[PDB]
Each structure stands twice: as C-alpha cells, then as structure tokens.
CSV table of C-alpha atoms and ligand atoms in Angstrom, one decimal:
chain,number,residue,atom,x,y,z
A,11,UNK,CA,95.8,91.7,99.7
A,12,UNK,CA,94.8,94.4,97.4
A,13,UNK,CA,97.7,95.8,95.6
A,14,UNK,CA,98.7,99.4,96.7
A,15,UNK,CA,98.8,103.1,95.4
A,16,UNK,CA,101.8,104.4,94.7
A,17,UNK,CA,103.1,108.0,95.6
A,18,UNK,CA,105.4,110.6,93.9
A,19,UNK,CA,108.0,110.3,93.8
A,20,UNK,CA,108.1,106.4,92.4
A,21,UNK,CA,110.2,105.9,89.4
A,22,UNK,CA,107.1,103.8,88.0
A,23,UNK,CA,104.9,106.4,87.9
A,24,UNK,CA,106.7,108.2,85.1
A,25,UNK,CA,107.2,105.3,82.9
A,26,UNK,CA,105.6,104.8,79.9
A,27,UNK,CA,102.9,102.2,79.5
A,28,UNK,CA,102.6,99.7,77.0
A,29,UNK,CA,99.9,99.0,74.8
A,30,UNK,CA,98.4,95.4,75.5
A,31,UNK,CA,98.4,92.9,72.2
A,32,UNK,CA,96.6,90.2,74.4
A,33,UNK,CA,93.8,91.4,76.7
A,34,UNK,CA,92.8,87.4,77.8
A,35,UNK,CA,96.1,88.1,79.5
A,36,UNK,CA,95.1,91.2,81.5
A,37,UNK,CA,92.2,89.9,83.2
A,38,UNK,CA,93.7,89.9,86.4
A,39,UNK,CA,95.3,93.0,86.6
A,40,UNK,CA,91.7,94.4,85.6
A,41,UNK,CA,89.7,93.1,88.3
A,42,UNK,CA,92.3,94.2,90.4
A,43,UNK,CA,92.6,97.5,89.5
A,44,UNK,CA,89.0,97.8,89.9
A,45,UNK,CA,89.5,96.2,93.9
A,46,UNK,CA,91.9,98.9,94.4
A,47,UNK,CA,90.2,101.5,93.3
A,48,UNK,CA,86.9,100.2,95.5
A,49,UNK,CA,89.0,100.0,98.5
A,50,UNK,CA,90.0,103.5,98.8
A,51,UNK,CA,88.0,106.2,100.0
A,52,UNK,CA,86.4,108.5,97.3
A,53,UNK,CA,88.9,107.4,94.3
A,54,UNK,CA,87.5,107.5,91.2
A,55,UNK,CA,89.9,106.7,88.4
A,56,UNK,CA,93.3,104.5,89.0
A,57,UNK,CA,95.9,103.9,86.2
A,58,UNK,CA,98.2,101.0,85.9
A,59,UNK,CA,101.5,102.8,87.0
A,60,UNK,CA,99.7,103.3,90.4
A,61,UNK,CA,99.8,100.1,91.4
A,62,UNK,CA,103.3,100.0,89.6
A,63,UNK,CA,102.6,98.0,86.3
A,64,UNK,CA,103.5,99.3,82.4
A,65,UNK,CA,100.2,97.9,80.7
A,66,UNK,CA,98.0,100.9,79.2
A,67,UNK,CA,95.2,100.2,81.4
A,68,UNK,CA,92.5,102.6,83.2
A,69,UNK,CA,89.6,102.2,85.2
A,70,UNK,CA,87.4,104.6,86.3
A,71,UNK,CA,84.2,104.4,88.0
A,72,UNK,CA,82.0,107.8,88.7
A,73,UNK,CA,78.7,106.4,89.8
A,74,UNK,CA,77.2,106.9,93.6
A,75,UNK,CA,76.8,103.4,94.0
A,76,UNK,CA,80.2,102.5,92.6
A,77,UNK,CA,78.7,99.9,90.8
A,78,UNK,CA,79.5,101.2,86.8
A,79,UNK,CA,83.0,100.4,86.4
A,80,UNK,CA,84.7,101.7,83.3
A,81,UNK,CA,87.4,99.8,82.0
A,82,UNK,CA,90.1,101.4,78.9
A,83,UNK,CA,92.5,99.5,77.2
A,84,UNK,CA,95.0,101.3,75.3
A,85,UNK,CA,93.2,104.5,75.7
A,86,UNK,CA,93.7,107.4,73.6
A,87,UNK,CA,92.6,111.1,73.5
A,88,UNK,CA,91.3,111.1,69.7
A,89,UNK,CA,90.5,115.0,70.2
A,90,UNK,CA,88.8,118.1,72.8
A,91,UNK,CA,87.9,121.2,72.4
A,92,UNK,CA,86.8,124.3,75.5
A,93,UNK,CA,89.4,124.5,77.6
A,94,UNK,CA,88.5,125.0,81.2
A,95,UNK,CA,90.1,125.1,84.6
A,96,UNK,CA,89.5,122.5,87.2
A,97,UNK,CA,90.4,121.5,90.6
A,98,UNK,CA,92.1,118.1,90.3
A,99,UNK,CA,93.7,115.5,93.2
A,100,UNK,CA,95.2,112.2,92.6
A,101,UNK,CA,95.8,109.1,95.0
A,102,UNK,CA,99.3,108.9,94.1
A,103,UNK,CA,99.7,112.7,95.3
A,104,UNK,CA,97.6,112.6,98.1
A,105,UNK,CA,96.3,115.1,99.9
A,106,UNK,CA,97.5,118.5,97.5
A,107,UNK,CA,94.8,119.5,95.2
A,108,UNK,CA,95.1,122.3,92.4
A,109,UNK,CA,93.2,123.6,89.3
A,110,UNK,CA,94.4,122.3,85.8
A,111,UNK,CA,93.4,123.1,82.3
A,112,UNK,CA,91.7,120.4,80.8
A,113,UNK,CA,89.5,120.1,77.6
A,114,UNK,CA,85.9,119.9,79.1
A,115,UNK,CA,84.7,118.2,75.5
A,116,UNK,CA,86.6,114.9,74.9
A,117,UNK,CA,86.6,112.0,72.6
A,118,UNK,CA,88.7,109.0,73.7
A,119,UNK,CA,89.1,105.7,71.8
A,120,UNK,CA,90.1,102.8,73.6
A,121,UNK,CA,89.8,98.8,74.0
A,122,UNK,CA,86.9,97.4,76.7
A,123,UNK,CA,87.8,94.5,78.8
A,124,UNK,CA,86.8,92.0,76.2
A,125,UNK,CA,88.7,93.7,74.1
A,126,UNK,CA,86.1,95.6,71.7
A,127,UNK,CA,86.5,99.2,70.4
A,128,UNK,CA,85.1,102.0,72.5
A,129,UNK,CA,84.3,105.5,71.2
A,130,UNK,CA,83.2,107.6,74.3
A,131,UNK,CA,82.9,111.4,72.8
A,132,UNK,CA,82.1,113.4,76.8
A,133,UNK,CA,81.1,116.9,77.9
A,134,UNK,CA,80.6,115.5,81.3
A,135,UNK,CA,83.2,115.1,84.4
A,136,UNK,CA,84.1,111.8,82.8
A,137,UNK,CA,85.9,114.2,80.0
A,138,UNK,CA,88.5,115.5,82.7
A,139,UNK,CA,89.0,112.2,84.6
A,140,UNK,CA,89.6,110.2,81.3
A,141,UNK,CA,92.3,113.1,80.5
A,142,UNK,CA,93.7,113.0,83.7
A,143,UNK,CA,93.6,109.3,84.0
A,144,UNK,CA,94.8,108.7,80.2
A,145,UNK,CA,98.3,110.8,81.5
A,146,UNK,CA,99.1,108.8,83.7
A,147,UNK,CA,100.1,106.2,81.2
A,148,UNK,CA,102.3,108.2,79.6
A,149,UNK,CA,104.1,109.3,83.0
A,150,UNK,CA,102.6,112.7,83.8
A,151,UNK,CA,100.8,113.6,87.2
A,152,UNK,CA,99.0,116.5,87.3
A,153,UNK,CA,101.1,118.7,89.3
A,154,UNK,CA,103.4,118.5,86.6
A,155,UNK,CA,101.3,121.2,85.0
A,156,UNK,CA,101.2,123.5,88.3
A,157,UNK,CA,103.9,127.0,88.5
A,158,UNK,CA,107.3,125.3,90.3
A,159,UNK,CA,106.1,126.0,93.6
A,160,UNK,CA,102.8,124.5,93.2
A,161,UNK,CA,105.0,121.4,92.7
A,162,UNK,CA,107.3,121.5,95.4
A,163,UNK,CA,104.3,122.7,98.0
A,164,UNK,CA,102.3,119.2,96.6
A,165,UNK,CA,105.7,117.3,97.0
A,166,UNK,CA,105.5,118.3,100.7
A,167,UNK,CA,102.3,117.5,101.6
A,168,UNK,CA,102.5,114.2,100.1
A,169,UNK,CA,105.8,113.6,102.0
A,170,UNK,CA,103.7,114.9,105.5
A,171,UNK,CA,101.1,112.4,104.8
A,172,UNK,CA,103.8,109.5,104.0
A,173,UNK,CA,105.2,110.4,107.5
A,174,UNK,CA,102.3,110.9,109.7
A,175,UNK,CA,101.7,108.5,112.1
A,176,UNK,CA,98.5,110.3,114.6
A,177,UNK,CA,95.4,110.7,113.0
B,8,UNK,CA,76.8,97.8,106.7
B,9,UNK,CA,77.7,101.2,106.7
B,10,UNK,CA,80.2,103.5,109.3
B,11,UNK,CA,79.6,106.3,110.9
B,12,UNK,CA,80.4,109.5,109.2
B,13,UNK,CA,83.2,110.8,110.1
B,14,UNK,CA,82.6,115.2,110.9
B,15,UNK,CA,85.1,117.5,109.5
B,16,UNK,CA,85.8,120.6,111.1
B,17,UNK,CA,84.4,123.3,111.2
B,18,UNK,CA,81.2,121.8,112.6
B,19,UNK,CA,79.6,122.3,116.5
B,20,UNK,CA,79.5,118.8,117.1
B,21,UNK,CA,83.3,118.5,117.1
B,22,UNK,CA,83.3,121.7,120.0
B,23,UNK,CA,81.0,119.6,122.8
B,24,UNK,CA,82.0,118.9,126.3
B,25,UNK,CA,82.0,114.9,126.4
B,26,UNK,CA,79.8,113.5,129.3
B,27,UNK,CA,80.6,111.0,131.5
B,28,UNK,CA,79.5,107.0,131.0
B,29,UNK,CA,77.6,105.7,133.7
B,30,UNK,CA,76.1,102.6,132.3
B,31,UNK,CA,78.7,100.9,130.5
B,32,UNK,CA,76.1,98.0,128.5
B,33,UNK,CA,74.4,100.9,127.2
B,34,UNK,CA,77.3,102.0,125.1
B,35,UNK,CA,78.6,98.7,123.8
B,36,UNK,CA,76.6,99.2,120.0
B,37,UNK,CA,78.4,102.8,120.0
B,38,UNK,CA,82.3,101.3,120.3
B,39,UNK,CA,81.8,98.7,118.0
B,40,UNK,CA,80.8,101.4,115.7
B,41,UNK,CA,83.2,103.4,116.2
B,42,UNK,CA,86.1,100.8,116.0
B,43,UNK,CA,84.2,99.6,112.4
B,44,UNK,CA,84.5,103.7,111.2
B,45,UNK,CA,88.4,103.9,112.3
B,46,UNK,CA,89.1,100.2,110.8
B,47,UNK,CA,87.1,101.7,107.8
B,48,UNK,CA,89.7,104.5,107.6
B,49,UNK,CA,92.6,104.3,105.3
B,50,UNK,CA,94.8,104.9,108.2
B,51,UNK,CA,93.2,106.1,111.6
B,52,UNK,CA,94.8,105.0,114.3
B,53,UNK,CA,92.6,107.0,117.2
B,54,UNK,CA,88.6,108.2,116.7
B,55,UNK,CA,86.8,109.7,119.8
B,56,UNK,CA,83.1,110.0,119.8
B,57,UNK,CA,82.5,113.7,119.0
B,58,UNK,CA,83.7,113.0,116.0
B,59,UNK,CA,81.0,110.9,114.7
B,60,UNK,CA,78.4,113.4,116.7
B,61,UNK,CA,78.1,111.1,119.9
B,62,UNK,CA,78.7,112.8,123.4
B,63,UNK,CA,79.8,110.0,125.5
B,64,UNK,CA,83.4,110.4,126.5
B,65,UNK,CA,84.8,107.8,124.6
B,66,UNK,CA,87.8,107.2,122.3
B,67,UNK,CA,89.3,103.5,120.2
B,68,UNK,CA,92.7,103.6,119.2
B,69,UNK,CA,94.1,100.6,117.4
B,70,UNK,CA,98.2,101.2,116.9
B,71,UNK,CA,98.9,97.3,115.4
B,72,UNK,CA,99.7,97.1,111.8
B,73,UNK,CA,97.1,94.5,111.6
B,74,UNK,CA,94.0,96.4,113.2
B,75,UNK,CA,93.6,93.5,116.0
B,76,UNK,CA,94.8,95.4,119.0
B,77,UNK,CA,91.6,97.7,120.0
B,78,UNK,CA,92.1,99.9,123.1
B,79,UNK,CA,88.6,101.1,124.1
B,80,UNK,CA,89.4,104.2,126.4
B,81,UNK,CA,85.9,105.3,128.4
B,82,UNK,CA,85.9,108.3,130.7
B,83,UNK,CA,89.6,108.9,129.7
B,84,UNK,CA,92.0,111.1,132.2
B,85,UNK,CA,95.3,112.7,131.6
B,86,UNK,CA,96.1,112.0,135.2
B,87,UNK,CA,100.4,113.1,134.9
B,88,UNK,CA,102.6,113.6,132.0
B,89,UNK,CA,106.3,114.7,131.8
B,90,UNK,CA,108.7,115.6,128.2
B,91,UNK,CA,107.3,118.0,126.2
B,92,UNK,CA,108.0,117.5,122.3
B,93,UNK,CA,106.7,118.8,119.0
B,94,UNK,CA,105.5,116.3,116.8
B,95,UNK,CA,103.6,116.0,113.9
B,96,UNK,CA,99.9,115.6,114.0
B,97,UNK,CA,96.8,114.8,112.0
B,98,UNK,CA,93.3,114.0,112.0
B,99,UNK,CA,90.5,112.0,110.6
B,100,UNK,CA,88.3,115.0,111.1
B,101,UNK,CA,91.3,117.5,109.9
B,102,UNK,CA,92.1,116.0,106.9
B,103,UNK,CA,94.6,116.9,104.7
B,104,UNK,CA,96.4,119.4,107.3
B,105,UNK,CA,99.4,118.2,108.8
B,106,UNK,CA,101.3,119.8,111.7
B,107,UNK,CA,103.5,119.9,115.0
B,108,UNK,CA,101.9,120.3,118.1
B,109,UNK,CA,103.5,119.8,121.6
B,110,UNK,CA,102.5,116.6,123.7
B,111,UNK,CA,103.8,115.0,126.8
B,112,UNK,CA,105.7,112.0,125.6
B,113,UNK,CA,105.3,110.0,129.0
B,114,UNK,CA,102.1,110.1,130.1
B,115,UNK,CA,99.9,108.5,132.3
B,116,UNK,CA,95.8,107.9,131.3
B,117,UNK,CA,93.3,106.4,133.3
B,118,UNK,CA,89.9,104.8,132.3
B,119,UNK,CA,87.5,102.4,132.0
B,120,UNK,CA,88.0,99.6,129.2
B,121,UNK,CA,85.0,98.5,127.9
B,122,UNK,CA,83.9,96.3,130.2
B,123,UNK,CA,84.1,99.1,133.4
B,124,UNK,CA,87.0,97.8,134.6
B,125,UNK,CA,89.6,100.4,135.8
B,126,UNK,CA,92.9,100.7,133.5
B,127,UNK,CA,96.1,102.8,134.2
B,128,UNK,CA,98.2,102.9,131.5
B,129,UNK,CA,101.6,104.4,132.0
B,130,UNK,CA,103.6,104.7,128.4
B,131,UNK,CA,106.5,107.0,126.8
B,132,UNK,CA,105.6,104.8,123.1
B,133,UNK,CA,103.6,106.5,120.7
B,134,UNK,CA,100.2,105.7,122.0
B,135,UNK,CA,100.8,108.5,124.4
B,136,UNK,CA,100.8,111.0,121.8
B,137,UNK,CA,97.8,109.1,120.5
B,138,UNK,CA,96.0,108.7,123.9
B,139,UNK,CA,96.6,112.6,124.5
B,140,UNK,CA,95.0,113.5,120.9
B,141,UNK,CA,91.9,111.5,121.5
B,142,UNK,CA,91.5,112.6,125.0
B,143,UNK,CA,91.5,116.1,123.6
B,144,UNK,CA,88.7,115.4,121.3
B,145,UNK,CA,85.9,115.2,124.4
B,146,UNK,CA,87.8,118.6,125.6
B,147,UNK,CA,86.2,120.1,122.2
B,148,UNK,CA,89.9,120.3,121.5
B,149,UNK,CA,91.6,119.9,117.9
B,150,UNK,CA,94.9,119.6,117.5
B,151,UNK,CA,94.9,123.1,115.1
B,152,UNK,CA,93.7,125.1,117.9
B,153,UNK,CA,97.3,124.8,119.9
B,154,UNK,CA,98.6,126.6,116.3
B,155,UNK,CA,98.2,130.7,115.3
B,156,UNK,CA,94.9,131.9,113.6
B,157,UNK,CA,96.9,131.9,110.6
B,158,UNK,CA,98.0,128.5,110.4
B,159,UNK,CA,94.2,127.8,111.4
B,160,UNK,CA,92.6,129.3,108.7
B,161,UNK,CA,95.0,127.7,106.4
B,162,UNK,CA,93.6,124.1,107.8
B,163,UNK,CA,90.3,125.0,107.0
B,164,UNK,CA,91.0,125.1,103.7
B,165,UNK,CA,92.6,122.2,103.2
B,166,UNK,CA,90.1,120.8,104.5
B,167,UNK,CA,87.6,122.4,102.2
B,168,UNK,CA,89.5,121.5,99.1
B,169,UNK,CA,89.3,117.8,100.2
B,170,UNK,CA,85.9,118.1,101.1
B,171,UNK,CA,84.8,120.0,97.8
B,172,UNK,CA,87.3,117.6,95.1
B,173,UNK,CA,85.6,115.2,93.0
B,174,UNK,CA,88.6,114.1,90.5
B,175,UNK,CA,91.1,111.4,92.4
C,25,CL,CL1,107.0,110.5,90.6
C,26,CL,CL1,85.1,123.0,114.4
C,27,ZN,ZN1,92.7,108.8,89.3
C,28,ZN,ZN1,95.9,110.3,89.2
C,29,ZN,ZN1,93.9,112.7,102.6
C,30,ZN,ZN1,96.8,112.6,104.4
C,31,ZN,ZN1,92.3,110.3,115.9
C,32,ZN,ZN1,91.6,113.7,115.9
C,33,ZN,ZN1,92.1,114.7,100.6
C-alpha cells in the first residue's frame, strides 16, 4: 500500500515542515516517497506534506527512465536570479495547470539521503521543480501565486476530479 | 511489460466505426491488454478499443474498488434504456475535462463476454452510465461531442495543457 497524494484543500498541506536532526530515522519515509512518486503517472517531484507528514523532505526524479532519483533533506533556496514564466501543475491540485514566475537560475543547499551536504546551482527544469517542490514545505501550492480566480477556477477542477466517478 | 498508450483527443483513431468480432480466440491478447492499460490507469474504470487505436468493437470496464471484477463487453448493443439524467463525465482519452452529459440510467446492453457467450445485462447502478460511455467510444462518440462547440473547444485545451505540462 503505497501511501497517497493528498489534494487541496488538506490542512497538512499548508503546514510547515520540520527540519530532520536524524536522517537514519527517515529512511522509510524516503523510499516511500520515492514509491509514491513512481506509482503515479508522469509525477515528477513529491514533497512530504503530500503524503501528509511534517519532515522537510523532497524527491524529485526528472530522468526518462525514472531511474535518477533525487532526494533533499532540509532543502533550501540559497539564491536565483532570471525570472521567467512557466506552466506548472501539481498532484495535490490535479488536473488545473497555470504559468508561475519562477527563478530559471537556482542554487539549493540541502542534505542527501545519507545525510551529506548538497550544493546543486541549476539553469535547467530541475531549477523550477526544486522551487516548486522546496514550497511545498513551507505550505504554499502554486496556485497560491495565480489572480483570485485562477484559484477558485483550480479549486473546482480539483473538486470535479475528486468527484468523478466515469472515466 | 508496457500498456498500451492510451490516444487523446483530437486524434482520427478515436472517430472510427468499430467492426464487429467474428472470431473471438483471435482477440484474447487484445483484452488482456486492454484490461492491463485501464488497471494501469490511476482511475479508469471503462477503456474501449479505439482508444488504444484497435478497431474491434470491444470495451473492459472494471467498477470494484479492488480492480478484480473485469467485464469484457464484445460486440456491445444499447438494446433499451429508460430515465434520462445529467451526470458528470470523464475520460481517459479527455483528460482533465470534466462535464455533464445526459445518459439513460436503466439500461439494457447486450454482448458477448469473452468467451462468445451471449450476456444481457439489465442495470439502473452506475455501470449503466459506464456501459453507455464505452459503447459510445466504437460509435466514434466522445462524451464532449453531446456539449456546444464552445464547451468543446474549451476540452481541447485542457487537454493540451495536460498533454504539453512537464512540472507535477
Ligand atoms: Cl490546501
Ligand atoms: Cl478526436
Ligand atoms: Zn511535485
Ligand atoms: Zn506540487
Ligand atoms: Zn488528470
Ligand atoms: Zn482528473
Ligand atoms: Zn472509459
Ligand atoms: Zn471514454
Ligand atoms: Zn493532467
């Protein structure tokens, strides 16, 4: 039983994670963020508070093959610079996609799953899924950056999806 | 051990007439594979063939919450129907677009299961929306095209957004 993906609105997705002391401890929750993330379709990133937990813990996995898993620890955006737009989703708002401004040059420091220091500086798509993924631990979705309506038009289409039975 | 890929509209293969199945042994590789790409789904509950690019009219449809139930529906009929009702539909080669659409919700379907035997199934549960969604499918039928040009046009591009996005 892989655990599930949470959808707005869900209380723990706008709590803020914790930064892990002990990462012997989060072993676990690791490998099965990374079986959640594997199971769904085309998902490429998955934060902690999707599967409804409070430690600051990514993973992310861009490749084809979905064999280079990327694993963050206490991740932090260090600093960016050229601002772009981009068109963004999210499994916890499924199915309501929108462009959001991101830094398209990032550095991000962070723990890997053994626990040692990571420095990954990115002009790449990595750049904008760390940025989106990294937000997710301190609460925010994406939408929460899109006009009012946006918002309440994504809030909607999540809700049809929840509801739909005939596909 | 891949699936079958799924088609998403627009695309001609989803517009065929479905043909008839004469010999049923020759299509037996063709519903396991289609009952591996719905179970491969996140949540399909109903694939018919023109949606992986097959013509032969046939359509799986698997309700249970565990995925054992299969219902293999060959040369599927609306044969009667009774109590129209909107209801909201999707579909795996729609995705993203949501919408209501008006089905009978008693019907009666006849077919061949999988092994050529004759089934009736007479139901007013939800597999008759189901059965009358995936029947439509060897029509050329999607469930958008009962909707305005409008509302249409909008589907498409959801669709394409899906389609197109890269960050989830
Ligand atoms: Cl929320
Ligand atoms: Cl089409
Ligand atoms: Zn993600
Ligand atoms: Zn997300
Ligand atoms: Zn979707
Ligand atoms: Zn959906
Ligand atoms: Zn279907
Ligand atoms: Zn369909
Ligand atoms: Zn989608």
């Amino acid at each position: 039983a892989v655990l599930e993906i949470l959808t707005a609105p869900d209380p723990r997705l706008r709590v803020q994670s914790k930064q892990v002391t002990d990462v012997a401890s989060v072993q676990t929750l690791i490998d099965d963020l990374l079986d959640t993330l594997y199971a769904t379709d085309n998902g490429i990133g998955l934060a902690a508070p999707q599967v409804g937990r409070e430690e600051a813990i990514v993973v992310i996995d861009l490749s084809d093959n979905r064999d280079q898993p990327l694993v963050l620890i206490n991740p932090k955006v260090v600093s960016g610079s050229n601002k772009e737009m981009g068109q963004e989703g999210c499994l916890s708002v499924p199915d309501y996609y929108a462009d959001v401004e991101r830094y398209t040059s990032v550095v991000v420091e962070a723990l890997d799953r053994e626990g040692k220091p990571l420095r990954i500086e990115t002009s790449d798509f990595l750049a904008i899924v760390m940025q989106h993924e990294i937000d997710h631990l301190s609460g925010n979705l994406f939408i929460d950056y899109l006009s009012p309506l946006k918002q309440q038009m994504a809030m909607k289409k999540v809700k049809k999806h929840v509801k739909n039975r005939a596909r």
